[PDB]
Amino acid sequence: MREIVHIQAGQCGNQIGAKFWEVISDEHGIDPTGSYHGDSDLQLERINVYYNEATGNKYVPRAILVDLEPGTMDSVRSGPFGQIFRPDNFVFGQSGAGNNWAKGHYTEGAELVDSVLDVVRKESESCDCLQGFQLTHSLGGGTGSGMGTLLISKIREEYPDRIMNTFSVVPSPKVSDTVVEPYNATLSVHQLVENTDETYCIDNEALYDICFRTLKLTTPTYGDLNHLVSATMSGVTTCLRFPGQLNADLRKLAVNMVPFPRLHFFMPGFAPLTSQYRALTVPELTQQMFDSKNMMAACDPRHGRYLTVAAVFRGRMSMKEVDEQMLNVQNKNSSYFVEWIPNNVKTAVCDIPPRGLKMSATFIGNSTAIQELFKRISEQFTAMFRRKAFLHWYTGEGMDEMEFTEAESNMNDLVSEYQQYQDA
Amino acid sequence: MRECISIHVGQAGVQIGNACWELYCLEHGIQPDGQMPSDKTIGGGDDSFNTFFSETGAGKHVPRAVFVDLEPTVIDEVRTGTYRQLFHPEQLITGKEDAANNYARGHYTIGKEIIDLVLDRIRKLADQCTGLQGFLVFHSFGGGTGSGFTSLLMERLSVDYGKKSKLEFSIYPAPQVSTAVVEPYNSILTTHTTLEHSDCAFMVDNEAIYDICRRNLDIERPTYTNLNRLISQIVSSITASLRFDGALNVDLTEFQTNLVPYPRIHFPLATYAPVISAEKAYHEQLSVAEITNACFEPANQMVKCDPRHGKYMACCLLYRGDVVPKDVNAAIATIKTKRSIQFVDWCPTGFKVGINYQPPTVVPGGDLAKVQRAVCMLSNTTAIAEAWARLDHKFDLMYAKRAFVHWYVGEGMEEGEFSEAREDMAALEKDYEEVGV
Amino acid sequence: MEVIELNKCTSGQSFEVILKPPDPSLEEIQKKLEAAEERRKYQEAELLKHLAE
Amino acid sequence: MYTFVVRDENSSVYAEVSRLLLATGQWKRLRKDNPRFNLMLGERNRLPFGRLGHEPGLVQLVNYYRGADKLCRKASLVKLIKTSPELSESCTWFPESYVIYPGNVWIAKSGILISSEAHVIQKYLEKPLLLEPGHRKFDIRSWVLVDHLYNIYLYREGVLRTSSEPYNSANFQDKTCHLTNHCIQKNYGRYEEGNEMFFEEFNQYLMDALNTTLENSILLQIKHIIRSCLMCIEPAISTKHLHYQSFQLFGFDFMVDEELKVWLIEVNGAPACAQKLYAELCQGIVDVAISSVFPLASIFIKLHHHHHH
Ligand SMILES: Nc1nc2c(ncn2[C@@H]2O[C@H](COP(=O)(O)OP(=O)(O)OP(=O)(O)O)[C@@H](O)[C@H]2O)c(=O)[nH]1
Ligand SMILES: Nc1ncnc2c1ncn2[C@@H]1O[C@H](COP(=O)(O)OP(=O)(O)CP(=O)(O)O)[C@@H](O)[C@H]1O
Ligand SMILES: Nc1nc2c(ncn2[C@@H]2O[C@H](COP(=O)(O)OP(=O)(O)O)[C@@H](O)[C@H]2O)c(=O)[nH]1
Ligand SMILES: COc1ccc(CNc2c(-c3ccccc3O)nc3ccc(F)cn23)cc1
Ligand SMILES: [Ca+2]
Ligand SMILES: [Ca+2]
Ligand SMILES: [Mg+2]
Ligand SMILES: [Mg+2]
């Protein structure tokens, strides 16, 4: 198990997905045209996980870029690292999806999906041992949300034994394109609960607050939020992209993180938060990554309990000190980790730090406090749905009110299920 | 002589085999290409070391070893590494997809598709043997392959070679170094399915070995390299009598007869001394009395537990180096008057001693210091059930909530096999308690 | 303290000292491996039937 | 910020040690099935000693010494004394005792039978020491605390648990005058409150009535019996060089005969303290047994005697 196939869908999907390929291409010594001008052999040892080798020792991202309009994807080709992506993997429609889940899932996107699956199958075939798929998308618009979840469903049909990962950007009124976002998100969460093994919940609420409160950006752009997203994505893929004892794969992650199959919504965290000169001591990384202020999902982990945790330290540091500090927070806050999964915190260290920082920590948590996120979206949803507001946009593409009711019910069930283990 | 086949399954089994076979080669004077200058019968022999090595007409000495991993990366390091020419490609078996820390994936799913390839390569070695005794199996309790694929192999080895002895070398899981949360499920699952098929099993608790490395070798944070090099000295102590001239534990049946009167209770506690740092400038060499006494300290055991609050059914002192009978008896005399060494009413309170004059060999540029004398005590004490109770509690905790169970079921297994396995262990713990009080 | 069965050779010596006296078949196996492939294959059919809906 | 768990709800002593610990700021309590504790305050039956000291990052301490039951069950204490060379069959301070399973007066116990006709049978002390005015029997209770280093700490306040009915040679069935237990009595508190005479008082009585002191006539022999019993089992129970550590509180019960000779009746593995003496004892447990292992931001005598021979 090595090769992953990456798909990015919609405005958000392709914006954050572009930053991901920018960040990791720098980490693996690949340049804006595709050539390797590195220095360490550790950079190329598992370059195969995310890149294909090409004619002339070029490395080509195993990346499929999907949108229902060409706006965002002409920007990706324009932008700093655009010329690296394989041009056949740009698969785009013309009319877009108007922030409408139904258009993504049932009408506009249905027209386009079979072409995306031909590129998926192309990349899937020239793979020694495919472990799975990761998708970047938001849940709030129509393409990345509705079409994205349509893809997932199709990929599962054709490759029912491979892993499915999402980086799924959850919406907030604090960073809001349209009033129908809670609808779109609730329709997609219903899909994600059934058809993914792992989902990283990137809440835009949490990114806005990190940007505002902790980084002193008064007027935060999507660029400022995506700076935080690509550093988190860099962190939660480190163990796949580098060595050397942890034979870490997506299946192993799924097995150890997910005690119950529907409860696979991970809260990510990063330390230190940036946009420095003083490197952080291991105690500080350990305090910071576990801090609510450093979570990429707007949930207080003190309101819930940690089912499982996976922590990843980057830089040159004492592993003695890393165990000591990781054991200190467990022993000093033991009520917040479930007694009925012994040794639920697993920690790893990797010598290569990220660009900029001498040392950093990335956190992956399956906390029951994630319910707060689904409760927040369940509330915004009901505010509108109890008066059937804005529904005509969805019923005009053939959807029924019963489908909204179903979806509202699955999410509220998810919330009940997370609440069940907080009290056990 | 009668030949022995070593089988190494999973990362843990394979890396520990590497460490053992390296050490075996240094001990017998065999070199990385397979040449053994001191051997004069070229192309064959029935010497003690031939139990573990075969010979080619070119003069190469070849392990009676099979390495098996469901994924290639760890066995690739044997293929491309310092002892690459030592092994024959057909001895080294790899898949493409590991068991993902899941007993049931390694046993039922990925197991099924490779069991016939492995048993065929085992038969290729068995058919070079004039009188096979049986098997030494190396594996982890906690890995998906180590647990899951091992237990299917043990089931088949009983069917295909029913008259032969099977010894287990087993790594009991330790949270300090453990890369998975479901090892308690994997360990109880494999222990149940393997119990009737193993004749004698030596548990090694990574916790114990890791603390031995911190405390006695001054290693800040022990790697697998550190743990394994220490484990191979212990393994080597135990298997030396199969590879050298002597009259104790000369075949695999004698391990069972000396160490295992009641056959389900077949988990002997290994204790080992002395472990001394190669970076220690000044070391006062320890005597027979001192190191025989070190064998009744819990801090030197392979599993942490308290033999004082238990009973022995057998003890075996395996000395290496400058030791003579009368020094051992004088040490045994002293120790009996101090310590709590209560035996079971039906067994003779005694010790079977074995001494080999050649002192322990150590890997050059390794962590262990060369010593004038070392000893490995093999005692079947009821105190080792402490290890089962801990592992059983951790299983109870997770299983009450059905946590992670769905991953196993999804590979075809039945929720029933969990409580079935756990009831056998419940019975196992109750057997130890009868004998022990 | 009686020191019985003393055997010596040039590479070592051994003795006892006494302080005080007192399997399923190839059918059954290939069967239940295949019953777990039944249930694996049922589970996957139910998935593909649900996806067909 | 040390952590602990409580698993005996009946311990009056360790209810108070629990309360004293919380009211500090540096000790948090946890739920009984959390593994991540420094201190266990464990259970009387089936304490899982084989799960302690396997939590990386925590030092673990427990308030029982595994194996100490060999001193606290009566049947095994008789067996330990008869069989151990350091307190032989010719042990001058233990009542001649025998074990058979389910001046020649005896007692039987583990419902109690004092007779000559008829578990453990034990010689009955026909001529015990009697307190005047009263003409009445008593037993002494000494509290002893063994820490993690096997220091043996005798607590300076013992207690006489008195009888309050004149003692009778010819009449054995009347239990209020022969059995001096604090329960069996409830003249319950005629001569002293609750049938308890502490040491300052009992010393003065001896001074006045017998022309001696408690130290010389009784306490030297108590200190010798405690030190002899615990040093005997030390190799079998010491937790020096072990992966978890133990302390324990014991209650030794004594009888003084008419010529001032002390006899060991029984050792108790889960004793309760006397009402007055809780605060002073439970504080000293924290000082000596617990805070020695887990330091923060005397009332005992230490029993040690290295005579050279
Ligand atoms: N002593 C020692 N323990 C090891 C080694 N490798 C892994 N372990 C331990 O063994 C357990 C994990 O089992 P592994 O052998 O890695 O798993 P595997 O058999 O390779 O199976 P999968 O990876 O599940 O397919 C944990 O308790 C590890 O700490 C090693 O080289 N030496
Ligand atoms: N051999 C003997 N001679 C004189 N009195 C004796 C005796 N054996 C027991 N007794 C008396 O019987 C009473 C109770 O017996 P014992 O002390 O054995 O049981 P117990 O369980 O009540 C003590 P504890 O519960 O405090 O540990 C004591 O007050 C003691 O004085
Ligand atoms: N963090 C982040 N959120 C985004 C970005 N672009 C859009 N969003 C959010 O995504 C949602 C709208 O989805 P969008 O991707 O534009 O729609 P689609 O193209 O139809 O899939 C809203 O919640 C936006 O706030 C981005 O680059 N970063
Ligand atoms: C109980 O938590 C876990 C146990 C096992 C795994 C599998 N692999 C993995 C990972 C990991 C796996 C896939 C992708 C990204 C990752 O960062 N990160 C760690 C860190 C430590 C460690 F021991 C294993 N890790 C994950 C979580
Ligand atoms: Ca159209
Ligand atoms: Ca030869
Ligand atoms: Mg938009
Ligand atoms: Mg493996």
Q: Answer whether A145 contacts ligand 3 (Cβ < 6 A).
A: yes
In whole angstroms, what separates CA B85 from the centre of its chain? 25
DSSP labels for D251-263? EEEEEEBTTS-EE
Query: Is D255 in contact with D60 (CB distance < 8 Å)?
Result: no
Alpha helix stretches (DSSP H) within chain D: 12-22, 69-72, 74-83, 175-178, 182-185, 199-210, 214, 220-237, 278-285
- The domain B269-383: what is its CATH number? 3.30.1330.20
Distance CA B274, CA B276 (A): 6
Query: Is D163 in contact with D138 (CB distance < 8 Å)?
Result: yes
Distance CA A325, CA D215 (A): 53
Residue that has been written with the tokens 């003795």 in this structure? C15
Query: Is B357 in contact with B322 (CB distance < 8 Å)?
Result: yes
Q: How was this structure determined?
A: X-ray
Q: Answer whether B186 contacts ligand 1 (Cβ < 6 A).
A: no
CATH architecture classification, B384-437: Orthogonal Bundle (1.10)
Q: Which long-range contacts (CB under 8 A, 24 or more apart) does A30-36 make?
A: A30/A59, A30/A84, A32/A80, A32/A81, A32/A83, A32/A84, A33/A58, A33/A83, A33/A84, A34/A58, A34/A59, A34/A60, A34/A83, A34/A84, A35/A59
Handedness of CA A39, A44, A50, A51 (dihedral sign): positive
Single out the residue of B90, B214, B66 nearest to residue B149, CA to CA.
B66
B254 tagged catalytic: yes
Q: Give the Å distance between the CA of A398 and the centre of ligand 3.
A: 24
Tokens of A136: 């970047």
Which CA distances in Å does B342 have to B150, B313, D62, D236?
35, 10, 25, 11
Tokens of B347: 């067994």
> Which chain D residue's Cα is nearest to A334?
D36
Superfamily of chain region B1-268: Tubulin/FtsZ, GTPase domain (3.40.50.1440)
A204 annotated as belonging to a binding site for a ligand: yes
A-B contacts at Cβ under 8 angstroms:
75
Single out the residue of B180, B235, B260, B243 nearest to residue B13, CA to CA.
B235
A-D contacts at Cβ under 8 angstroms:
25
Single out the residue of B397, D52, B69, D39 nearest to residue A424, CA to CA.
B397
Query: Is A170 in contact with A203 (CB distance < 8 Å)?
Result: yes
> Omega before B175 cis (within 30°)?
no
User: Domain ranges in chain B?
Assistant: 1-268, 269-383, 384-437
Cβ-based interface (< 8 Å): residues of D facing B:
48-51, 53-54, 56, 66-67, 235-237, 241-243
Handedness of CA B73, B75, B80, B83 (dihedral sign): positive
Report resolution (Å) to 1 decimal. Answer: 2.8
Q: Which residues of D130-143 are buried (b: 16+ CB within 10 A; e: fewer)?
A: ebeebebbbbbbbb
Annotated binding site of B for GTP: 10-12, 15, 71, 99, 140, 143-146, 179, 183, 206, 224, 228, 252
Q: Answer whether B73 contacts ligand 1 (Cβ < 6 A).
A: no
Distance CA A234, CA A23 (A): 7
Distance CA B11, CA B180 (A): 14
Q: Answer whether B171 contacts ligand 1 (Cβ < 6 A).
A: yes
Q: Give the Å distance between the CA of A389 and the centre of ligand 3.
A: 22
Q: Answer whether D124 contacts ligand 2 (Cβ < 6 A).
A: yes
Neighboring chain A residues of D31 at a CB cutoff of 8 Å? 335, 339
Q: How far apart are the first and last CA of chain A?
A: 36
Contact C18 B353 (CB under 8 A): no
What DSSP state is assigned to residue A257? H
- CA triple D301-D302-D303, angle to 5 deg: 115
Q: Which helix (H) or strand (E) holds A187?
A: helix A181-195
Contact B305 D50 (CB under 8 A): yes
Residue B215: phi and psi, rounded to 5, are -65, -50
Neighboring chain C residues of B325 at a CB cutoff of 8 Å? 3, 6, 13, 15
The chains in contact with chain B, meaning 3 or more Cβ pairs closer than 8 Å, are: A, C, D
Shortest Cα distance from B278 to chain C (angstroms)?
26
> Which chain D residue's Cα is nearest to A326?
D57
Q: Answer whether D249 contacts ligand 2 (Cβ < 6 A).
A: no
Q: Which helix (H) or strand (E) holds A417?
A: helix A401-423
Pocket test for ligand 2, best of D160, D181, D267 (most atoms within 8 A of CB): D181
How large is the greatest C-alpha to C-alpha distance in chain A, in angstroms? 61
Tokens of B269: 């506690």
Task: Indicate the length of chain C as a whole number.
Answer: 53
Look up the domain containing D10 and give its range: 2-62
Contact D57 A323 (CB under 8 A): yes
Distance CA C34, CA C45 (A): 16
Distance CA A191, CA A153 (A): 8
Taking the Cβ of residue B335 and every Cβ of chain C, the question of whether any pair is shorter than 8 Å is answered with no
Distance CA B141, CA B182 (A): 11
- Name the packing angle between helices B150-160 and B183-194 (round to 10°): 10
Ion ligand 7 neighbours (CB, 5 A) are A 11, 177
CATH assignment at residue D22: 3.40.50.11480
> Which chain A residue's Cα is nearest to D26?
A332
User: What are the structural domains of chain A?
Assistant: 1-259 (3.40.50.1440), 260-369 (3.30.1330.20), 370-424 (1.10.287.600)
